[PDB]
């Protein structure tokens, strides 16, 4: 009986309910998606979601509040992606 609990899985827009999951390969939280594009959770959003950086909560529901398209310009980078990867950084808040 969860009429409202339906998540977006791609093409994320402000206001979408999303599942935020731990990605151990990139050592970061990401949006669950069917797309191959990566949507990393912005480090700013972790406190609002009761998540911690670096028991470790495997998923949380949130709402997208902002998205930014970015590119890795160093092979050593915060998201452990190959040089040149284009990806999104997403700020999300907790959901009711």
């Amino acid at each position: 009986s969860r009429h409202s609990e339906k998540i977006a899985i791609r093409d994320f827009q402000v206001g979408d309910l999303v599942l935020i999951i731990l990605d151990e390969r990139h050592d970061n939280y990401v949006l669950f998606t069917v797309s191959p594009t990566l949507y990393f959770l912005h480090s700013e959003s972790l406190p609002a979601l009761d998540l911690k950086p670096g028991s470790r909560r495997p998923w949380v529901l949130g709402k997208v509040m902002e998205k930014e398209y970015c590119q890795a310009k160093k092979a050593q980078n915060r998201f452990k992606v190959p040089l040149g990867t284009k990806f999104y950084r997403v700020k999300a808040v907790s959901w009711n």
Binding site: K67, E68, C70, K74, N77, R78, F79, K86
Partner: peptide, 11 residues
């Protein structure tokens, strides 16, 4: 901070 660059800010 310069490991990544912004290509497109939030719309």
């Amino acid at each position: 901070d310069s490991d990544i660059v912004t290509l497109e800010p939030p719309k």
